[PDB]
Design a protein around this ligand. Structure first.
Ligand SMILES: Cc1cc2nc3c(=O)[nH]c(=O)nc-3n(C[C@H](O)[C@H](O)[C@H](O)COP(=O)(O)OP(=O)(O)OC[C@H]3O[C@@H](n4cnc5c(N)ncnc54)[C@H](O)[C@@H]3O)c2cc1C
Ligand code: FES
Ligand code: FES
Lengths: 98, 49, 477, 99, 99, 467, 98
């Protein structure tokens, strides 16, 4: 068995649950396996997640700047190279917090 | 600046969020002294993204 | 949160636990966030399923120069419970007694108090256990494993059955509240919203199912568009598995309010349809808009007096998993997993089975793949799926069986349902302890009894624990 | 309302209205409208998914169907990328009437 | 009426379940919502009408705003894109009627 | 010269100012507003961005279909192909069978991975309208789902296979699949297949992209500008640009060039053009493994074994064999196999052609090869095994750092004929150094020795010291 | 709001009903998904109708705050509100008038 190459046997899955009472209305779905309401739209790619929301023409993009050090004092921040990048608007820091 | 990274770093720097939390019931002393066997050990469990 | 535990357990030769002391440490990182509540939940589950007369747990949350660790499905539970199952595994081995028996005889019984003095009513765990033992054919499968192991030197199998108790409700009592708002427009269509957020758990689906029963109209007449602070304020986070419980009641109450207002128009036209009642209410100047609200009653634990109920109820379940390890590579297959889960009378068995399976597979990840690495100076190196391996299609148990427990209504939640989101996660520890059983068999083949297996039990940890002529040569000529 | 910023994918609509107080609509020619840059489409009663019957007493059309009943009766709507292009395309919708 | 802000609608289609949000200069959110729903053939619970404020109404936006709102709604539904219409004074005075 | 022309869901797209840095995923989402295709990782691991590409293969004279990761596909590489996204196959008004079945089987929870999995399954059915259960599972090696635990997705899709309490769903109510009702291959692309392809140039904010049409163009550009970075599948360069903030101001894509895409049978083995996708290598060697006697296919089978647990369909359809070799990662799964088998590489420039059998020397340092800056790799010959020649490949499936410290190995032995005495022995390893290595202290000791326990213990002692 | 100062009046009303400064009350917009089945803003009637609506919604809120008022008759509005919240009392209400 040390020389055998990886081999997957046939999958065999069982899901057991309880039927609802026979007298429960066909319209009463509680306890019944109703598909997630958005499943069809999710499969069709029509369901809207945050970034799928269209941009306003004046919309801006943000990118966080993070510490490359576990514990340190910040001694200087230089933005001189940031500012040369086309479309640059601003660098927000603690001092911009209202 | 000096960094505290691991659990063991934090223990020996007394670096904690507030005080010890504790639950205890019964009589530990009696319990262990009356047992047939005692087994000690340690376990590490990694996190998850 | 990573956890370090130091434990000492005292037990009898029968495997009956008589004493337990556990010191837990969590790596919280650089802000408090939810770290203290998470440590509380670990301590509330350090018993897992087991009655222990003499017991001491402490927890300390470490403050460190790392990204702040937070809530993750289980919220300290799986950490507390893995430690419990870990010393329990060593109890069984030390006694020379079958692990399934040692667990069974230490298990709470109905009416028992926990270590935090909450009483266990509607204690379905024994039935979950008995059903899972029978449906998994555990005793016959144990024999085939032992047989495989005698016939194979460089591959081994393991088999383990693990139970769980998981407390349902936020540990901070006031968070156990929820709100709904419902509109019926004059075409009879209903727009509903509640404080819960949809993140794939089918909460909106459940709330529409609830609203449709409550109002006695089809699901097709009810729509949820979204969650908003300007329709329902001061909402709890969608968490602690409790959102269908809290919002279900809110939704239910808002619907009862609407029904009460439609009652006169129902009486006057008991046959005439929904739409006519609504238009009659409208042209009679009756409000077709209502709030609904719920608070889980009677919660509040004190650490000071070790009294008061932190939980509204408990979820229970059991999983038997079998693995085959490759002793030479540390690779393994998950051959079969059988799960019996008490979710009360499921609101939605498709969705609840979905949640058991998803939760279990996230746990499979926690306990066997999924390792984060950090440089010595505290920089995360594992930052994408190239280096962080979450379960893939090929990772899941080849035979995967899930049962929802029959005839176990839970009176004190919405339409006798139970929460489902988090409780199944820890049941993947069954893969972990099956791996541990496989490793032992490999160790006895060549040729100390309580060997170390940290979590996650990755190929590295499995291989290194499978001591042989190769590991010996590499560690020392 | 119009101070609300436009989405980058936003289109402009311009209404096309009857120049006759009462007449049958004989023909509609959009041929010149299609040449206006940024033209997307001309909406008429045929494009209504469910009901063309609107108004408080349900006696109004969304879009005229067969006959126009005032100077100003809405026949359709041009959709285009900009309002200038919608105005221009709207002028290139030629309607023929029988009084 | 000569409300200094003429009639204006922005319709935003969400592309799920026929959900649409309208931003409208109207005194009548309810009828705006109903007439859009009915025209599209979707239930009222899919349609949201929002009004921050109007630059005047005086009754002229109690019903007649919907002749713009419905047209715009349709365009948004057909294109799957936000659509906007603000009337020019001449269009408003002609289309929307008076005392 | 200059225009980029391709199709998306049957509609022609003309892009007059193609930036080489623009990915297909960004183009679909921000330019075309088709947001069905998602960003999950931007790294090729998760499949949430999976779309289908259709094109006329000039070299096989047929319409082909394959899945790719849109997050890594430069639009500048897609001239005259047709893209199909999730929006292209159906919608809620008329769901494709793939869509309907994943939804109704409870295969979609949060729904974020659903489009990608749908497109992986869809693409499988366009290639094989009746796949086995095994092919269906293999279709998702590049697709991750965090919610479902996968079971409902495979079970729902199991209904497409030839070899297939209440129920959670009812397969009998599923609309049947009619492969004839899929969208036409754009006739315009069939008309253009007849026009000869010429060199294209795209100029972006920072990067110039030259899509070369002939070997002459490519070698000319490399002779005059050795700095020109070859891009083929972009599965490594894409990562270097996005995550390591590397910038290659001049890129040349030679993917169209026939000589880099050819497959030639020779007396010593099978020669693949450097730009051959791994999926082609896989399909060629698999046919050879099934046809030829076992004694000839030991090296082929080692390659196939390394490719088994090697990314998904999306990566292998565009990841080139040559790309894997020249990247020269310490943890390449292929380089140890090529090294152990001594595969023959052909290297060319304007006015030079040479051959090297891959050995320890081919990789002299971290991510370096012995190519000169103006050379490109033309082809690699994967050898037939001889009588008495055996090969195994192995790899650690457990990765901790970006590009180091994952063991992967090629191992070859040649026996003096009729004997169990070692004529040759090659043991090559990734993940044990900053480059692919050969255990050249240990193996020479073993020549002449019989294949027995004394050899086992000598090799193990040797490897424990040398590695 | 069409310039007749209806929102100003309703803030005035709610400020009196709740006994808090108008500064603490805000009206952002009118929406069919916050209040349904609304009559047009017409017949000069809008302040009369919505005034009563607002007043009833405010009275419901006052009724829920009473216990916390009686337990702390001086300590401010913000204290009653936080006390109600942390005791799981609903702080949302509809109001209606005919
Ligand atoms: C998600 C994912 C998983 C992966 N898993 C694995 C794995 O398990 N094992 C493994 O070994 N690899 C793996 N890879 C790497 C993959 O095989 C390589 O990225 C791929 O083969 C590179 O081919 P390419 O055409 O995409 O190269 P590109 O990224 O286009 O180019 C790669 C390098 O080769 C150069 N180059 C390309 N062709 C030539 C040529 N003809 N002559 C000279 N230079 C050339 C380029 O200039 C560049 O430096 C993985 C990649 C991804 C994205
Ligand atoms: S976004 Fe994850 S592979 Fe493309
Ligand atoms: S359904 Fe959430 S990632 Fe698959």
């Amino acid at each position: 068995s040390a020389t055998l190459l990886f081999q997957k046997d046939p999958p065999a899955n069982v899901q057991l649950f309880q039927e609802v009472p026979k007298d429960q209305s066909e319209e009463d779905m509680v306890g019944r396996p109703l598909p997630h309401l958005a499943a069809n739209m999710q499969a069709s790619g029509e369901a809207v997640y945050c970034d799928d929301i269209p941009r306003y023409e004046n919309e801006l993009s943000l990118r966080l700047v993070t510490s490359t050090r576990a514990h340190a004092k910040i001694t200087s921040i230089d933005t001189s190279e940031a500012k040369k990048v086309p479309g640059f608007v601003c660098f927000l820091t603690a001092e911009d917090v209202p | 600046l000096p960094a505290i990274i691991t659990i063991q770093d934090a223990i020996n720097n007394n670096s904690f969020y507030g005080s010890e939390i504790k639950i205890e019931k019964g009589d530990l002393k009696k319990g262990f002294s009356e047992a047939d066997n005692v087994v000690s050990g340690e376990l590490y469990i990694g996190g998850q993204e | 949160h990573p956890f370090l535990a130091k434990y000492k357990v005292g037990f009898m030769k029968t495997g009956t636990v008589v004493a337990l002391e556990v010191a837990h440490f969590s790596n919280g990182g650089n802000t408090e966030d939810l770290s203290r509540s998470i440590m509380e939940r670990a301590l509330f589950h350090m018993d897992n399923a087991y009655k222990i007369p003499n017991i001491r747990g402490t927890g300390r949350i470490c403050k460190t120069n790392l990204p702040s660790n937070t809530a993750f499905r289980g919220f300290g539970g799986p950490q507390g419970m893995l430690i419990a199952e870990y010393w329990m595994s060593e109890v069984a081995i030390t006694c020379g007694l079958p692990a399934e028996e040692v667990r069974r005889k230490n298990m709470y019984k109905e009416g028992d108090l926990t270590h935090f003095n909450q009483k266990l009513e509607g204690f379905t765990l024994p039935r979950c256990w008995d059903e899972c033992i029978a449906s998994s054919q555990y005793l016959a499968r144990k024999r085939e494993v032992e047989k495989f192991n005698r016939e194979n030197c460089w591959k081994k199998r393991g088999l383990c059955i693990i139970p769980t108790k998981f407390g349902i409700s936020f540990t901070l009592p006031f968070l156990n509240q929820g709100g709904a708002l419902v509109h019926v427009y004059t075409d009879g269509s209903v727009l509903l919203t509640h404080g819960g957020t949809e993140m794939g758990q089918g909460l909106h689906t459940k709330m529409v199912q609830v609203a449709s029963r409550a109002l006695k109209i089809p699901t097709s007449k009810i729509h949820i568009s979204e969650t908003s602070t300007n329709t329902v304020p001061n909402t709890s986070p969608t968490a602690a598995s409790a959102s269908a419980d809290l919002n279900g009641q809110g939704v239910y109450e808002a619907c009862q309010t609407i029904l009460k207002r439609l009652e006169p128009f129902k009486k006057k036209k008991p046959t005439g349809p929904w739409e006519a009642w609504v238009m009659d209410a409208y042209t009679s100047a009756v409000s077709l808009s209502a709030t609904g609200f719920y608070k889980t009653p009677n919660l509040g634990y004190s650490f000071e007096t070790n009294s008061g109920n932190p939980f509204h109820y408990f979820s229970y379940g059991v999983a038997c998993s079998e693995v085959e390890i490759d002793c030479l590579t540390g690779d393994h297959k998950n051959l079969r997993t059988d799960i019996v889960m008490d979710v009360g009378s499921s609101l939605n068995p498709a969705i609840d089975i979905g949640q058991v399976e998803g939760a279990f597979v996230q746990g499979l990840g926690l306990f066997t793949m999924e390792e984060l690495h950090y440089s010595p100076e505290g920089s995360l190196h594992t930052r994408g799926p190239s280096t962080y391996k979450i379960p893939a299609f090929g990772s899941i148990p080849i035979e995967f069986r899930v049962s929802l427990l029959r005839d176990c209504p839970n009176k004190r939640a919405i339409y006798a349902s139970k929460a489902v989101g988090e409780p199944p996660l820890f049941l993947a520890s069954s893969i972990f302890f099956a791996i541990k059983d496989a490793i032992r068999a490999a160790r006895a083949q060549h040729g100390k009894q309580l060997f170390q297996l940290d979590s996650p039990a990755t190929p590295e940890k499995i291989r290194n624990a499978c001591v042989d002529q190769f590991t010996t040569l590499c560690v020392t000529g | 309302c119009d101070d609300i910023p436009r989405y980058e994918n936003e289109l402009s609509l311009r209404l096309v209205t009857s120049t006759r107080a009462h007449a049958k609509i004989t023909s509609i020619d959009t041929s010149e409208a299609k040449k206006v840059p940024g033209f997307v489409c001309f909406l008429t009663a045929e494009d209504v998914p469910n009901s063309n019957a609107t108004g408080l007493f349900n006696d109004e059309t969304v879009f005229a169907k067969d006959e126009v009943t005032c100077v100003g009766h809405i026949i359709g709507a041009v959709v285009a990328d900009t309002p200038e292009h919608a105005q221009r395309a709207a002028r290139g919708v030629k309607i023929t009437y029988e009084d | 009426h000569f409300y200094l802000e003429t009639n204006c609608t922005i319709a935003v289609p969400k592309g799920e379940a026929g959900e649409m949000e309208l931003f409208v200069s109207t005194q009548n959110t309810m009828k705006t919502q109903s007439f859009v729903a009915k025209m599209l053939g979707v239930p009222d619970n899919r349609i949201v009408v929002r009004v921050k404020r109007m630059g005047g109404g005086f009754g002229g936006k109690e019903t007649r705003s919907t002749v713009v709102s419905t047209a715009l709604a349709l365009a948004a539904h057909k294109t799957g894109r936000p659509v906007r219409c603000m009337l020019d004074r001449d269009e408003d005075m002609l289309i929307t009627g008076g005392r | 010269a200059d225009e980029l022309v391709f199709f998306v869901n049957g509609k022609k797209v003309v892009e007059k100012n193609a930036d080489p840095e623009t990915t297909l995923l960004v183009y679909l989402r921000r330019k075309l507003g088709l947001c069905g295709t998602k960003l999950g990782c931007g790294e090729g691991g998760c499949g949430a961005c999976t779309v289908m590409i259709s094109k006329y293969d000039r070299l096989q004279n047929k319409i082909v279909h394959f899945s790719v990761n849109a997050c890594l596909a430069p639009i500048c590489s897609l001239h005259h192909v047709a893209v199909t996204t999730v929006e292209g196959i159906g919608n809620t008004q008329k769901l494709h069978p793939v869509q309907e079945r994943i939804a109704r089987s409870h295969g979609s929870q949060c729904g974020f991975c659903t489009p990608g999995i749908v497109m992986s399954m869809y693409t499988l059915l366009r290639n094989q309208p009746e796949p086995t259960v095994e092919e269906i599972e293999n279709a998702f090696q590049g697709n991750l789902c965090r919610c479902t635990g996968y079971r409902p997705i495979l079970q729902g899709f199991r209904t497409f296979a030839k070899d297939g309490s209440p129920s959670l769903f009812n397969p009998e109510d599923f609309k049947p699949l009619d492969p004839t009702q899929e969208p036409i291959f754009p006739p315009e692309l069939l008309r253009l297949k007849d026009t000869p392809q010429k060199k294209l140039r795209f100029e972006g904010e920072r990067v110039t992209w030259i899509q070369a049409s002939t070997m002459e163009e490519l070698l000319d550009l490399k002779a005059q500008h050795p700095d020109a970075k070859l891009v083929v599948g972009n599965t490594e360069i894409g990562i270097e640009m996005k995550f390591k903030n590397m910038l290659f101001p001049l890129i040349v894509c030679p993917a169209w060039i026939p000589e880099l895409n050819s497959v030639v049978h020779g007396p010593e083995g099978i020669s693949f053009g450097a730009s051959c996708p791994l999926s082609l290598v896989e399909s060629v060697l698999a046919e050879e493994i099934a046809k030829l006697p076992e004694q000839k296919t030991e090296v082929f089978r080692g390659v196939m074994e390394q490719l088994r647990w090697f990314a998904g369909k999306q990566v292998k359809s565009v990841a080139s064999i040559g790309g894997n070799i020249i990247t020269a990662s310490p943890i390449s799964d292929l380089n140890p196999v090529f090294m152990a088998s001594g595969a023959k590489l052909t290297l060319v420039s304007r006015g030079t052609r040479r051959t090297v059998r891959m050995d320890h020397t081919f990789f002299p340092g971290y991510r370096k090869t012995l190519l000169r800056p103006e050379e490109i790799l033309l082809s690699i010959e994967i050898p037939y095994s001889k009588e008495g020649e055996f090969f195994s490949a192995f790899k650690q499936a457990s990765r901790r750092e970006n590009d180091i410290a994952k063991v992967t190995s090629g191992m070859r032995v040649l026996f003096k004929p009729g004997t169990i005495e070692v004529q040759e022995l090659s043991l090559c390893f990734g993940g044990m150094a900053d480059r692919t290595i050969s255990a050249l202290k240990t193996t020479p000791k073993q020549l002449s020795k019989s294949w027995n326990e004394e050899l086992l213990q000598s090799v193990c002692a040797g490897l424990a010291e040398e590695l």
